[PDB]
Design a protein around this ligand. Sequence first.
Ligand SMILES: *[C@@H]1O[C@H](CO)[C@@H](O[C@@H]2O[C@H](CO)[C@@H](O[C@@H]3O[C@@H](C)[C@@H](O)[C@@H](O)[C@@H]3O)[C@H](O)[C@H]2NC(C)=O)[C@H](O)[C@H]1NC(C)=O
Ligand SMILES: *[C@@H]1O[C@H](CO)[C@@H](O[C@@H]2O[C@H](CO)[C@@H](O[C@@H]3O[C@@H](C)[C@@H](O)[C@@H](O)[C@@H]3O)[C@H](O)[C@H]2NC(C)=O)[C@H](O)[C@H]1NC(C)=O
Ligand SMILES: *[C@@H]1O[C@H](CO)[C@@H](O[C@@H]2O[C@H](CO)[C@@H](O)[C@H](O)[C@H]2NC(C)=O)[C@H](O)[C@H]1NC(C)=O
Ligand SMILES: *[C@@H]1O[C@H](CO)[C@@H](O)[C@H](O)[C@H]1NC(C)=O
Lengths: 426, 426
Amino acid sequence: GTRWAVLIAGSKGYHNYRHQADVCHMYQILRKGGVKDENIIVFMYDDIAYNESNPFPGIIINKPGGENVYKGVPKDYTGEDINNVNFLAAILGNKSAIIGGSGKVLDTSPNDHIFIYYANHGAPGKIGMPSKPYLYADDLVDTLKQKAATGTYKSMVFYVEACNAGSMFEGLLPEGTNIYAMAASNSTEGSWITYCPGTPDFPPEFDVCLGDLWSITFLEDCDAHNLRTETVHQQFELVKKKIAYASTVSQYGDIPISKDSLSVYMGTDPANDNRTFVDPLKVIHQHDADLYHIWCKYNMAPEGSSKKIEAQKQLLELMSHRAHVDNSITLIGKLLFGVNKASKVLNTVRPVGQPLVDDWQCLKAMIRTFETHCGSLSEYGMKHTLSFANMCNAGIQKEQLAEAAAQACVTFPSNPYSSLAEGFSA
Amino acid sequence: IGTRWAVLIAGSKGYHNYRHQADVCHMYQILRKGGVKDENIIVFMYDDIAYNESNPFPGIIINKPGGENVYKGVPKDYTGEDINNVNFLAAILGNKSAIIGGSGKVLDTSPNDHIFIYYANHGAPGKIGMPSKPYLYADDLVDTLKQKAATGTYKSMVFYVEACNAGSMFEGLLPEGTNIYAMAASNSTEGSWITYCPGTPDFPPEFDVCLGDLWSITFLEDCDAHNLRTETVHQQFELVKKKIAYASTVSQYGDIPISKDSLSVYMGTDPANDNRTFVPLKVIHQHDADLYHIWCKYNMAPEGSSKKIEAQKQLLELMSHRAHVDNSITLIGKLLFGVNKASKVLNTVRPVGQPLVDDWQCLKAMIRTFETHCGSLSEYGMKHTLSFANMCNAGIQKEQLAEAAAQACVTFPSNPYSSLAEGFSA
Ligand SMILES: *[C@@H]1O[C@H](CO)[C@@H](O[C@@H]2O[C@H](CO)[C@@H](O[C@@H]3O[C@@H](C)[C@@H](O)[C@@H](O)[C@@H]3O)[C@H](O)[C@H]2NC(C)=O)[C@H](O)[C@H]1NC(C)=O
Ligand SMILES: *[C@@H]1O[C@H](CO)[C@@H](O[C@@H]2O[C@H](CO)[C@@H](O[C@@H]3O[C@@H](C)[C@@H](O)[C@@H](O)[C@@H]3O)[C@H](O)[C@H]2NC(C)=O)[C@H](O)[C@H]1NC(C)=O
Ligand SMILES: *[C@@H]1O[C@H](CO)[C@@H](O[C@@H]2O[C@H](CO)[C@@H](O)[C@H](O)[C@H]2NC(C)=O)[C@H](O)[C@H]1NC(C)=O
Ligand SMILES: *[C@@H]1O[C@H](CO)[C@@H](O)[C@H](O)[C@H]1NC(C)=O
């Protein structure tokens, strides 16, 4: 067969440098392993390498002293072409459903191998897209089930770097689909970011973090050995042990597929033929990366300068929106369930093997109806899919949420993060 | 001394225009082998060739039947509708703040830097194509270069133009003392030629498109053949002029003393050709490439098949539009200057050193008012810029053209080539 790959950075903006650096690094592994460009679909916004804020134009690094991972990466879908339509049509191998971009799709046959890698972002039952709406677990798993029912591949390995990455598969991805999935975090955990300003042997020109903790660990591992000697299971156990202090690396789908060597999906760099596989970093939360970047921007700028005043204003707008969104959800929950029961209900997590929500259309409606009254959730507010999922499972309807949200937000917010200009999250 | 910079642009779109993107891809491989860095090579290509449904080799683009995959490793900065006048002229000027979409890579050149610009699509008198309308007119291009020469920092520049009437882009416009030397595939009055076309030598029978343009092929294959430290821009000018002489007249513009420099000053040199010291093809007109492609498509399709019926219909639509546009211009001319006087007046070409038109805004207005009454000029009708320039220079106003065109076209055409859906040409 042929080795196929789908690499996607689900975010945009220079502060999300890491997600595109992660995906660029994954391409270099595949290229060195002999995986052909015509079989590697790349989704990356492309607002990093030639950004005004980038101190090294044309260079993207995924490690403090690392190689330029940006050089040679074939960009198939950039800008607003990274969306649900193009991403799900690429997985299904449907060229006729593609709008913009190169038109490269998974035109696979039953002996082919597929490696999917997503890096950005997440929230319970949600993965980001640079252009709204976001990708929800129901739509992603339905696409994979459709692709599995077609029988145009031998086996598939899906690596997802996001907050609550396990919620994308838990109680959704069935067995016998020949899909094995590995997640940075479980259904209730957030993911972590490493290689951050002023902590390692870091270049002082950068105000952004270079990589994501789980991505860095698995990617650097792929570089270290002859991938014919390391199985997907050995990598699962290794990266789980390493990242244990931060998050719980989780498995989903056909776990017997992880018996295969990494070379089945990635190939192997002939330079590491002799490097046979033999069986803590200063980290910050993914959710606090926006706050941290603006803090770094603010701290690095001179006193009294226009850049410092701008960054201080940006920090207040960011904090105001955080408070607005959190206080709105708190008031809604108390209006809905009562002052004392509100916390218990909205923070309820489901047991192992159970999906986030039973009614996915309710969840999407809950997200939309909150945003029409209370404004956009932005990146921060997406954590509240746990609150909306708990409302859906408790028998709450969109009409009950709308009446509570109109009472919680008498006036629509002016804050730029509350802007519905880019559309709704669902 | 200094850095080598490049701007590569394929000004067309559509699988039938395969050659223009293959030409640009080939030029990148020359620069990459010569040591010119990716962060200094701005690439503009639509990217609808490599993964086109019609391409028999997905991921591969060839600029010669026995050629290498010129598509592999090409960094795409501006794709799709991001290839436009705003982004192209802002890239030349080095103005990042004027860029909308794409990577944001611009000519941020210093006084010691060398620039190589290569355009391939498409042309018409005083016009070069853009995949997204409006087109680029000689006044706007030369004004940008004059701005870059007056306020921009660089040592020298070489501009290579592959287009019909390529010389009309500079003739009577580009002044001396700019350090811009320009080389054109054809002079101000003649069209350009296409090679590596179906059914001639031992050409791949899966292709129904031409792989390259005559002038591009000749200069590109030359760049591959020698140590570019031993060949000057002048030697290449004389060599490619002698070779292509049967088809078109290779023309020079601007600071001709700049051609004394070796090709390595702008392109570098492939260390593989260090020892290689510097010491007719079956061709079809660029204007007839749309006709020929549909003929090839029609001939290759089986009898009675849906593809053959479709291609036959496409050929009639193409021919009908050609006749419509030509007959409209002929009637307008006779309405304006008389039945027997019109032909000479409209077909008058410029003597050496004279610009196409004195009033460029009149020319643009003439193009627009013709199209509002008689429909789009398309690729074919763009040759009539000469007819409109002659009307402008003869003292004809847009109101006189509108009254003549309303009399020539009582009814707006239904033909798909006459569609103003993509906007006006000017
Ligand atoms: C460099 O990195 C920053 C990301 O932080 C990015 O800035 C963003 O640029 C957007 C468009 O250029 C801009 O969006 C809006 O688009 C138009 C249509 C209007 O709505 C405007 O209000 C606005 O320009 C967005 O505001 C801006 N984001 C931030 C956080 O400043 C750059 O574009 C990146 N790209 C490059 C090529 O360097
Ligand atoms: C642009 O390049 C065109 C070529 O398409 C060129 O036109 C050619 O001019 C030749 C004279 O320089 C001319 O040659 C003549 O041909 C016949 C009539 C004999 O008398 C010959 O002895 C004589 O040399 C050739 O016919 C003519 N071709 C065409 C198609 O018109 C122009 O000179 C160039 N135009 C400009 C504005 O520089
Ligand atoms: C393959 O090339 C053809 C052009 O020959 C492209 O088809 C055009 O697509 C645009 C947008 O989809 C339409 O507006 C036109 O009607 C199409 N033209 C024709 C002649 O079919 C097509 O987009 C290309 N495919 C890829 C993957 O880029
Ligand atoms: C997720 O991992 C955390 C450890 O950080 C643990 O508290 C929790 O029990 C796990 N949740 C699920 C749903 O397995």
